[PDB]
């Protein structure tokens, strides 16, 4: 019995959760009285947290013991717990599952959790430009965690705004949700609106990305995968970076701007000397990082989201963000970008309006700015995640024997 | 006076030694009364240890001060010390070697040690299918550490079951011992049975692997070398991976199952994004790792030794082991595989009989299982090594820097 | 708003400064009575130091608080502070500059400093073979810091004996100073027969190295740049190594020995398994390092400066220095080479005359020798930097308690 799974993407260092930005629907998790925070504030949870993800208008936290906590908007079921008591969504609450959870992901109105034996649970809903499309069945959200139907243990989950990707232990990439911009990587453009002529149920059941064998026999398998808001990056076993999804501002790293429905081997990412280890993306920009402590951006320049300095222009190839210290992880919010450094600091850039930058001000930042303030004093940042209008940090007291 | 050598493969972090598995002949180093340990147990060594290696049925520990300690079967002289005292082979004792040693290696019935000035000592014996062949001289084992007659400084030593490889400062690879499966990489089959008519001096006198450099240069030189039970891997200064020795289950990463007597350039390892840093191998399988925290396995699948999940089948190309956290080092025992993670944990997989897996059970593990236990709590694993029926860990109290 | 910039090269870890070698003109910083130190000696600085650099015959230390301390020969203004008082140049003194400096660099007669917002300050003067040429204007040294502001923030500064290179946030390399050996990589035209002094103003103004990009875009841009005494190495965004400057002993890694006035794409550095991350060089040799902890040398072999062992001969391709632990950084002095290990040790090799090797003796070392002594006991080395006849170390107390 009990055959567990692990993965290099799983997080295990215990920490405290801090939130900042907008909190009108409970996404800050600071109760009914705090609707906005200009600087990071502590979210008290009765356990240490190893992972903290920001969805569109909600926040999902994973404790060290495998307990999921959630807060924010539950109108579509994204919290995965009953919030009938007025205000219960404004503070952390438990998502009840029997098994220990080892990784979570969050999109615009959905949340996913991977158990320690590789089963995937999903709740909330997905939506398309026009409206809700359902979750696992056409047109139906789920308020409760529901098991995704698969026959093989999954080692990683990742979410875009309205799609879920699942990497199996054997390297198959299964995708489900909205496929309108080609972010599922397994649906023709013909079936972009609502599964076209072959129903929604095809989009919402987990099905595998099927390519080639960039040799002569097999179908390509993957060693990792990541999502941006409406796009996906998948790294093959050979080390090639495949992109599918929206690229209307060249955010996928393509020369043209049409959406990519069939996964493309991105030649803008081919092994210079950079082993690509982390990808993230908001609606129209991408921030990624290599194995040598460097972060790069591509996509739309407006409001400083590329972090390349004032007067930066649209990029269609990964462009080095030189102004950062050595980098350990990167993340994007809808119009903001972040890097966590190897020495435990966090830098932010992009659209300032929602107070996601942590400068204390609502001005945009075209160059990376180190986030400071009381709650980051004498602490090391472990991660940063960002949604539509808020940002969630995971921190640890900066050790002192 | 003597010039000292060093190498990136040398270990220098002090810790404690723990052992588990079978201990009939003293290989656990826990006394005459402890014949088996299902979970790791502390071994009383009078000094901190920087390297701990498991031979077939013995264990060799290198202290921070350069002293070698040994415990286990001394029938063949593998302990390199006098075990007249009853039960003295079952607890650590000082190897009789007046040198500051900086690296050790162990085989089925032999042990090697590298001095700080690049001289190699060897003790015990080598055997072929047929029986004991001697050590440095034909038909003579050595109960005491004896100096290898080489006249160039050696920077790294590695052992298979019955062979020794020595990488010089200039990148030559000298090999000696049993060459019956091509593991010396310099002996024709036609003379691999104890050298045939030419007798054992054709196997036991240190001689160097000679490959006529491609692009007609001199001869190929190497930056690293590792051993499996009956095979050797060597990385050229160009970084090409070469393999020689037993590949009856494709453990060398070759298409056929024929022992390789001539070094092969292993095209299966050629990759733009994977830099090969570590190799290990039991009888019939190989576990290796790249520079990006990923471990791969190849060879025989029986009993779960590949760590690729249930129903895994024989592999002939390095195959990602996805169910592991980021990996820092790998090792194999006869029929078992291990990976130490960057965060200080250790996972095991393969044949369970001997209790080497540290699960507490004797069932095989077809996927990696995390080793737990009271001795591992609040400690980080620095290294893991495995022999026929036991496993040896080097650990430290929850690391401070 | 004066937006701050950083870079992965900027040093942040507080330490103590040690010096050794010759101190005739104050470069040891130990006062008027200490003219020579055979082993590392502690130099009292009022604050913790994050970066310690050796100029030709001076030393520049950057405090954690952003202040600069200097000591050594101030005949040309390299110290950037008033040493009218007899002996005041023999001990650390503060440079009066109301800026938070985040990086420094030092040459034969000049020092440069980079502010937290990306502006460069330079002082002293540059010389060519025929004498002093000026600093930013012909024939004019500066005893105080002079601002050099480009249209874009500078993220890294690096110095050779008599040239300064600045890498902008946008990946442009701006060079100035002496160009007699091609180390500016930009006015080949001015050195074709002609003396650099005929277009001297053009050389003392910071101007961009302009390389057309083949199957071209505009021009090539760089992710990093380093200097040797009379040459410069720049790594493009694609990871190609470019070099320009002196190569009379093949130290640039060129087949020929003529000085290279245009950036050369060094095919000797092209290799699928090596990613180059660090470069250093004395007059006639180079010591560089890859992303996998390996250090390499090339150039003149006389006096052991390649660290490849006795009888080494001239090298024109990066040649592995096998006899080192895993490397974290490399440095050169005029005729010596160093490597700091990942475990905090420092190794030296090359010409021993000036007592730069830290052996306690003045003999050459043709292979790497670990630097020991009282001041390195129980301490971890953070950096090493070396000039004409002295060497500067930055160390920290072993991280226990």
């Amino acid at each position: 019995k009990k055959v567990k799974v692990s993965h290099r993407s799983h997080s295990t260092e215990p920490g405290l959760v801090l939130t900042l930005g907008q909190g009108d629907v409970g996404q800050l998790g600071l109760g009914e009285n705090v609707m906005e925070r200009k600087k990071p504030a502590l979210v008290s949870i009765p356990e240490d947290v190893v992972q903290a993800e920001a969805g569109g208008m909600h926040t999902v936290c994973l404790s060290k013991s495998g307990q999921v906590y959630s807060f924010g908007c539950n109108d579509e079921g994204a919290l995965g717990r009953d919030t009938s008591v007025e205000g219960s969504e404004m503070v952390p609450g438990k998502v009840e599952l029997q098994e220990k959870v080892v990784q979570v992901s969050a999109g615009d109105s959905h949340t996913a959790a991977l158990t320690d034996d590789g089963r995937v649970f999903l709740w909330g809903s997905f939506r398309d430009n026009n409206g809700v499309i359902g979750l696992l069945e056409p047109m139906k959200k789920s308020m409760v965690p529901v098991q995704v139907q698969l026959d093989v243990p999954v080692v990683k989950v990742a979410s875009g705004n309205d799609h879920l990707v699942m990497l199996t232990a054997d390297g198959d990439l299964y995708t489900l949700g909205c496929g309108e911009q080609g972010q599922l990587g397994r649906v023709p453009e013909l079936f972009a609106n609502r599964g076209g002529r072959q129903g929604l149920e095809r989009l919402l059941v987990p099905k595998c990305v099927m390519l080639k064998s960039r040799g002569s026999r097999g179908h390509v398998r993957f060693q990792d995968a990541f999502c941006g808001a409406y796009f996906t990056f998948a790294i093959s076993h050979e080390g090639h970076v495949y992109g599918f999804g929206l690229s209307n501002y060249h955010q996928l790293g393509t020369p043209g701007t049409e959406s990519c429905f069939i996964p493309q081997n991105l030649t803008s990412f081919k092994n210079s000397t950079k082993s690509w280890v982390g990808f993230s993306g908001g609606q129209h920009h991408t921030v990624c990082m290599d194995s040598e402590g460097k972060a790069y951006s591509l996509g739309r320049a407006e409001y400083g989201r590329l972090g390349l300095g004032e007067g930066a222009e649209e990029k269609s190839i990964p462009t080095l963000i030189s102004r950062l210290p050595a980098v350990s992880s990167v993340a994007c919010g809808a119009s903001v970008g972040y890097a966590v450094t190897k020495d435990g600091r966090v830098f932010a850039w992009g659209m300032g309006t929602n107070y996601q930058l942590g400068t204390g001000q609502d001005e945009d930042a075209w160059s990376p700015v180190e986030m400071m303030g009381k709650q980051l004093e004498n602490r090391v940042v472990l991660s940063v995640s960002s949604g539509g209008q808020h940002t969630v940090l995971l921190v640890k007291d900066k050790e002192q024997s």
Side-chain angles (χ1 to χ4, degrees), chain A residues 5 7 75 81 98 108 118 139 143 146 153 162 257 273 286 310 314 343 369 377 379 397:
Chain A
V5 299
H7 194 254
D75 288 0
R81 56 185 180 91
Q98 195 78 45
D108 193 44
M139 303 313 281
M143 305 301 280
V146 179
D162 290 290
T257 53
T273 28
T286 293
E310 308 282 326
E314 196 161 302
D343 64 21
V369 184
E377 284 177 7
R379 283 182 176 148
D397 284 310

Side-chain angles (χ1 to χ4, degrees), chain A residues 200-268:
Chain A
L200 206 35
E201 32 274 295
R202 201 186 77 270
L203 300 188
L204 301 180
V205 171
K207 296 195 74 63
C208 177
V209 177
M210 295 291 291
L211 301 167
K212 301 124 176 166
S213 72
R214 161 38 193 211
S216 292
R217 265 166 227 175
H219 82 253
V220 178
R221 288 177 145 76
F222 303 93
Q223 57 177 299
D224 211 341
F226 308 87
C227 300
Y230 303 106
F231 43 99
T232 309
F233 295 98
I235 309 174
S236 63
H237 284 152
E238 218 189 303
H240 302 142
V241 179
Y242 287 82
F244 39 103
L246 183 69
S247 196
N248 58 345
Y249 292 96
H250 301 97
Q251 59 262 51
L252 264 187
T254 60
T257 53
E258 303 300 323
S259 294
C260 301
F261 294 81
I262 306 192
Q264 198 180 130
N265 195 332
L266 303 172
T267 57
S268 61

Side-chain angles (χ1 to χ4, degrees), chain A residues 37-114:
Chain A
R37 284 288 308 174
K38 283 195 180 182
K39 291 294 182 61
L42 179 65
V43 185
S44 49
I45 303 182
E47 306 187 63
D48 296 327
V49 172
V50 296
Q51 189 188 353
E53 296 290 317
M57 300 286 263
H58 75 291
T59 304
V60 185
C61 298
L62 174 64
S63 68
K64 175 66 175 177
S65 69
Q67 176 64 60
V68 181
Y69 289 85
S70 62
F71 44 96
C73 181
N74 201 26
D75 288 0
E76 291 303 310
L79 301 198
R81 56 185 180 91
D82 182 89
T83 53
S84 62
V85 178
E86 188 183 15
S88 57
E89 83 279 14
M90 309 288 285
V91 296
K94 301 169 62 182
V95 183
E96 305 293 352
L97 239 22
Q98 195 78 45
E99 299 303 321
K100 179 205 187 308
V101 176
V102 294
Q103 185 178 62
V104 294
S105 58
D108 193 44
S109 298
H110 80 270
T111 302
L114 178 66

Side-chain angles (χ1 to χ4, degrees), chain A residues 81-371:
Chain A
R81 56 185 180 91
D82 182 89
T83 53
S84 62
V85 178
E86 188 183 15
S88 57
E89 83 279 14
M90 309 288 285
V91 296
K94 301 169 62 182
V95 183
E96 305 293 352
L97 239 22
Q98 195 78 45
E99 299 303 321
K100 179 205 187 308
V101 176
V102 294
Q103 185 178 62
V104 294
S105 58
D108 193 44
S109 298
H110 80 270
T111 302
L114 178 66
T115 61
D116 59 352
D117 46 35
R119 279 153 31 230
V120 180
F121 288 81
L122 180 61
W123 57 95
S125 66
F126 302 120
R127 71 164 287 136
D128 74 336
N129 284 331
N130 284 317
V132 182
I133 61 171
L135 185 71
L136 289 183
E137 295 182 68
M139 303 313 281
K140 301 166 65 178
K141 61 180 180 181
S142 186
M143 305 301 280
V144 304
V146 179
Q147 195 175 259
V148 171
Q149 300 296 288
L150 257 177
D151 68 339
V152 53
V154 173
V155 294
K156 183 181 181 178
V157 295
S159 291
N161 278 16
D162 290 290
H163 71 291
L164 175 66
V165 307
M166 296 167 281
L167 182 66
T168 67
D170 291 350
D172 286 320
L173 186 62
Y174 283 75
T175 61
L176 64 84
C178 186
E180 202 166 51
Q181 304 303 143
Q183 62 264 64
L184 299 186
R186 62 176 180 78
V187 166
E189 188 176 354
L190 302 66
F191 302 132
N193 171 30
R194 297 203 183 189
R197 281 197 188 188
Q198 199 174 78
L200 206 35
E201 32 274 295
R202 201 186 77 270
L203 300 188
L204 301 180
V205 171
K207 296 195 74 63
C208 177
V209 177
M210 295 291 291
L211 301 167
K212 301 124 176 166
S213 72
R214 161 38 193 211
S216 292
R217 265 166 227 175
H219 82 253
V220 178
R221 288 177 145 76
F222 303 93
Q223 57 177 299
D224 211 341
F226 308 87
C227 300
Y230 303 106
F231 43 99
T232 309
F233 295 98
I235 309 174
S236 63
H237 284 152
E238 218 189 303
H240 302 142
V241 179
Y242 287 82
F244 39 103
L246 183 69
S247 196
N248 58 345
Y249 292 96
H250 301 97
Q251 59 262 51
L252 264 187
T254 60
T257 53
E258 303 300 323
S259 294
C260 301
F261 294 81
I262 306 192
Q264 198 180 130
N265 195 332
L266 303 172
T267 57
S268 61
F269 291 90
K270 293 206 166 193
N271 175 53
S272 312
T273 28
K274 327 166 184 303
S275 182
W276 297 107
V277 306
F279 287 85
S280 60
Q283 311 179 319
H284 307 135
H285 75 295
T286 293
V287 177
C288 55
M289 66 170 283
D290 62 14
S291 64
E292 297 165 352
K294 282 165 288 156
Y296 306 70
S297 57
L298 52 171
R300 187 182 185 197
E302 297 162 62
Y303 311 145
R305 72 195 76 195
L306 298 183
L308 301 174
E310 308 282 326
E313 302 193 316
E314 196 161 302
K315 302 302 178 188
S316 57
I317 61 172
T319 305
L320 180 62
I321 303 172
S322 62
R323 297 174 170 83
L324 299 165
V327 177
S328 63
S329 60
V330 294
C332 292
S335 303
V336 290
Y338 299 90
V340 180
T341 57
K342 282 166 176 163
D343 64 21
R345 293 177 286 160
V346 61
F347 288 68
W349 60 89
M351 191 184 78
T353 320
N354 305 309
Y355 288 96
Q356 292 168 284
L357 297 181
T359 61
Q361 312 289 344
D362 74 325
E363 309 293 337
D364 300 337
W366 293 66
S367 301
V369 184
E370 182 189 340
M371 292 211 262

